Design an enzyme around this catalytic site. Structure first.
Site, PDB file in Angstrom:
ATOM      1  N   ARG A 124       0.869  -1.177   0.000  1.00  0.00           N
ATOM      2  CA  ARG A 124       0.000   0.000   0.000  1.00  0.00           C
ATOM      3  C   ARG A 124       0.901   1.221   0.000  1.00  0.00           C
ATOM      4  O   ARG A 124       1.800   1.340   0.825  1.00  0.00           O
ATOM      5  CB  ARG A 124      -0.912   0.074   1.240  1.00  0.00           C
ATOM      6  CG  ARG A 124      -1.871   1.293   1.185  1.00  0.00           C
ATOM      7  CD  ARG A 124      -2.811   1.469   2.399  1.00  0.00           C
ATOM      8  NE  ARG A 124      -2.086   1.862   3.595  1.00  0.00           N
ATOM      9  CZ  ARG A 124      -2.383   2.901   4.371  1.00  0.00           C
ATOM     10  NH1 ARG A 124      -3.419   3.687   4.105  1.00  0.00           N
ATOM     11  NH2 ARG A 124      -1.628   3.144   5.429  1.00  0.00           N
ATOM     12  N   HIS A 138      -2.901  11.053   1.436  1.00  0.00           N
ATOM     13  CA  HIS A 138      -2.172  10.762   2.654  1.00  0.00           C
ATOM     14  C   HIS A 138      -1.558  12.017   3.272  1.00  0.00           C
ATOM     15  O   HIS A 138      -0.386  12.034   3.648  1.00  0.00           O
ATOM     16  CB  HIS A 138      -1.096   9.705   2.409  1.00  0.00           C
ATOM     17  CG  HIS A 138      -0.791   8.867   3.616  1.00  0.00           C
ATOM     18  ND1 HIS A 138      -0.300   9.398   4.788  1.00  0.00           N
ATOM     19  CD2 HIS A 138      -0.898   7.534   3.824  1.00  0.00           C
ATOM     20  CE1 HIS A 138      -0.115   8.430   5.667  1.00  0.00           C
ATOM     21  NE2 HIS A 138      -0.467   7.289   5.107  1.00  0.00           N
ATOM     22  N   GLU A 150      -6.846   8.315   7.295  1.00  0.00           N
ATOM     23  CA  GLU A 150      -7.103   9.018   8.549  1.00  0.00           C
ATOM     24  C   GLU A 150      -7.698  10.435   8.475  1.00  0.00           C
ATOM     25  O   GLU A 150      -6.996  11.424   8.714  1.00  0.00           O
ATOM     26  CB  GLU A 150      -5.804   9.041   9.378  1.00  0.00           C
ATOM     27  CG  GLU A 150      -5.181   7.657   9.558  1.00  0.00           C
ATOM     28  CD  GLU A 150      -4.010   7.610  10.547  1.00  0.00           C
ATOM     29  OE1 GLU A 150      -3.593   8.663  11.080  1.00  0.00           O
ATOM     30  OE2 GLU A 150      -3.501   6.499  10.791  1.00  0.00           O
ATOM     31  N   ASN A 159      -6.398   1.676  10.974  1.00  0.00           N
ATOM     32  CA  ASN A 159      -5.026   1.936  11.426  1.00  0.00           C
ATOM     33  C   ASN A 159      -5.109   1.925  12.953  1.00  0.00           C
ATOM     34  O   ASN A 159      -5.873   2.700  13.540  1.00  0.00           O
ATOM     35  CB  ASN A 159      -4.531   3.312  10.974  1.00  0.00           C
ATOM     36  CG  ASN A 159      -4.157   3.360   9.502  1.00  0.00           C
ATOM     37  OD1 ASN A 159      -4.106   2.337   8.816  1.00  0.00           O
ATOM     38  ND2 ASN A 159      -3.874   4.561   9.015  1.00  0.00           N
ATOM     39  N   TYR A 174      -2.748   1.536  16.766  1.00  0.00           N
ATOM     40  CA  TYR A 174      -1.441   1.528  17.410  1.00  0.00           C
ATOM     41  C   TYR A 174      -1.487   1.386  18.928  1.00  0.00           C
ATOM     42  O   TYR A 174      -0.674   0.662  19.524  1.00  0.00           O
ATOM     43  CB  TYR A 174      -0.683   2.807  17.062  1.00  0.00           C
ATOM     44  CG  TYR A 174      -0.300   2.930  15.603  1.00  0.00           C
ATOM     45  CD1 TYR A 174       0.834   2.296  15.102  1.00  0.00           C
ATOM     46  CD2 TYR A 174      -1.077   3.684  14.726  1.00  0.00           C
ATOM     47  CE1 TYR A 174       1.188   2.414  13.754  1.00  0.00           C
ATOM     48  CE2 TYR A 174      -0.737   3.809  13.381  1.00  0.00           C
ATOM     49  CZ  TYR A 174       0.394   3.171  12.901  1.00  0.00           C
ATOM     50  OH  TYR A 174       0.719   3.284  11.571  1.00  0.00           O
ATOM     51  N   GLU A 201      -2.641  -0.332   8.620  1.00  0.00           N
ATOM     52  CA  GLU A 201      -1.486   0.103   9.399  1.00  0.00           C
ATOM     53  C   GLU A 201      -1.457  -0.376  10.859  1.00  0.00           C
ATOM     54  O   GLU A 201      -2.382  -0.124  11.631  1.00  0.00           O
ATOM     55  CB  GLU A 201      -1.391   1.635   9.442  1.00  0.00           C
ATOM     56  CG  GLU A 201      -1.017   2.341   8.164  1.00  0.00           C
ATOM     57  CD  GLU A 201      -0.857   3.841   8.389  1.00  0.00           C
ATOM     58  OE1 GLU A 201      -0.517   4.237   9.530  1.00  0.00           O
ATOM     59  OE2 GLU A 201      -1.055   4.616   7.433  1.00  0.00           O
TER      60      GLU A 201
END
Length: 445
Positions: free
Chosen positions: A76, A119, A164, A293, A295, A353
């Protein structure tokens, strides 16, 4: 403990154009809002800029070859809007040729691409007209998305519309932490609305052009925990969750903005005046998959301060990456479960991600990043449990094939499974990368 993933599970790595390309003023590329943002003192640590970065603009052929021999089948990447439309009414053929060439290399290597349209590198000339706070910008996005879909499309299996929305709007126009760096809640919310519409614009174009590739948006989402049992801390946590998760997920799947958050923002929304008839319908298009995504999670307590949400995140010290982010794989499982619960419920979920920035040290030519390795392994165990339990998780892209420009953190934080020597631009897979190679080979670990 032995974990085996579905037969068709998609394995890949991700990157973004501004974070790795370099060649900022080459091939007709004009500045993005980040090229400008990184020059404001105090906005990026060390005052770093995306100048040169990993010089992927020149080493792309080698990077994709490195991917291939590393066992990856999916890549990606994002397209730099500034290379495509360097100015109003342009259309840079030289910019389109770079990606065309990138794609030739991907195909030759046998890789399956996922192209992310936006992005965060909005052309500065667009920001000069007002950027994301202006409806018109959506028209410019149409121009961009359409060109990209016409020149490619018969070669793109996966379309990732916007990466995002939260960061580009809230941090970019609200907290001032990301480019362009405005601090105006009114603009931020208008910006978020406009960017969400762009996922709709890209979706409409996709169906009109009759493209066959899968299309989906990507939302960063985080699991939210209240700091204590106190009612105000629980309410505060609800607000954080509405602030990052629901505000974007609700419009995408349900055609509306979180009413509780709409009430909290009140006057900053100015009566939702930026919402035009049909806008919500335009935005509500889940597509073929939901990009996620993830984290870390947040531990929230209430405060009566001057901030928008009047919330404070209590920072954990134990189990954290080089960025101070808590490592809590369990939360990853809870979030995926919650996302399936409300929102997607059956819709294929793709982790575009997941990764960690740890402190690396080159020893005898290798990078023993046991920390990053463990982080990935544990979060995959979370993904495994979601799967096997019915979860519609279909793929996983480790964030950062390469160490790169980590936005406001600059080059000080490395997310790559591959080490980049910024003094020579030499690439060196880390142990986590080697571990990933065989893992995909056994497709399980």
């Amino acid at each position: 403990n032995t974990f085996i993933f579905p037969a068709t599970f998609m394995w890949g790595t991700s990157t973004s154009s501004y974070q790795i390309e370099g060649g900022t003023d080459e091939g007709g590329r004009t500045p993005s809002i980040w090229d400008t943002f990184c020059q404001i003192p105090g906005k990026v640590i060390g005052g770093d800029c995306g100048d040169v970065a990993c010089d992927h603009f020149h080493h792309f052929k080698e990077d994709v070859q490195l991917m291939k021999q590393l066992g990856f089948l999916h890549y990606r990447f994002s397209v730099a809007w500034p290379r495509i439309m360097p100015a109003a009414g342009i259309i840079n053929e030289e910019g389109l040729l770079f990606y065309e060439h990138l794609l030739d290399e991907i195909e030759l290597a046998g890789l399956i691409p996922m192209l992310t349209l936006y992005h965060w590198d909005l052309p500065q000339w667009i920001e000069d007209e007002g950027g994301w706070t202006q409806r018109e910008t959506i028209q410019h996005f149409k121009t961009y998305a359409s060109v990209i879909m016409d020149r490619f499309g018969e070669r793109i299996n996966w379309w990732n519309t916007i990466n995002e929305p939260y960061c580009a709007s809230i941090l970019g126009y609200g907290t001032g932490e990301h480019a362009p760096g405005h601090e105006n809640w009114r603009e931020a919310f208008t910006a978020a609305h406009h960017i969400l519409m762009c996922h709709g614009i890209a979706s409409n174009l996709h169906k009109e052009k009759g493209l066959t590739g899968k299309i989906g948006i990507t939302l960063n989402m985080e699991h939210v925990d209240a700091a204590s049992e106190r009612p105000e801390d629980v309410a505060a946590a609800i607000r954080r969750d509405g602030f990052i998760n629901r505000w974007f997920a609700e419009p995408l799947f349900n055609g509306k903005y979180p009413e509780d958050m709409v009430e909290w923002y009140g006057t900053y929304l100015n009566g939702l005046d930026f919402v035009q008839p049909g806008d919500m319908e335009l935005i509500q298009q889940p597509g073929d998959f939901l990009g996620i995504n993830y984290y870390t999670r947040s531990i929230i307590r209430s405060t009566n301060d001057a901030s928008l949400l009047q919330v404070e995140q209590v920072h954990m010290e134990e189990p954290v990456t080089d960025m101070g982010w808590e490592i809590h794989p369990e939360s990853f499982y809870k979030l995926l479960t919650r996302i399936e619960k409300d929102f997607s419920k059956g819709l294929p979920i793709l982790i575009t991600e997941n990764g960690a920035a740890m402190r690396d040290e080159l020893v005898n030519g290798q990078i023993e990043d046991t920390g990053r390795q463990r982080y990935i392994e544990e979060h995959l165990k979370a993904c495994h449990r979601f799967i096997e339990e019915g979860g519609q998780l279909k793929g996983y892209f480790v964030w950062s094939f390469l160490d790169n420009f980590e936005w406001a953190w600059g080059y000080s934080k490395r997310f790559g499974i591959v080490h980049i020597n910024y003094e020579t631009q030499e690439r060196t897979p880390k142990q986590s990368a080697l571990w990933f190679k065989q893992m995909m080979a056994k497709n399980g670990f």
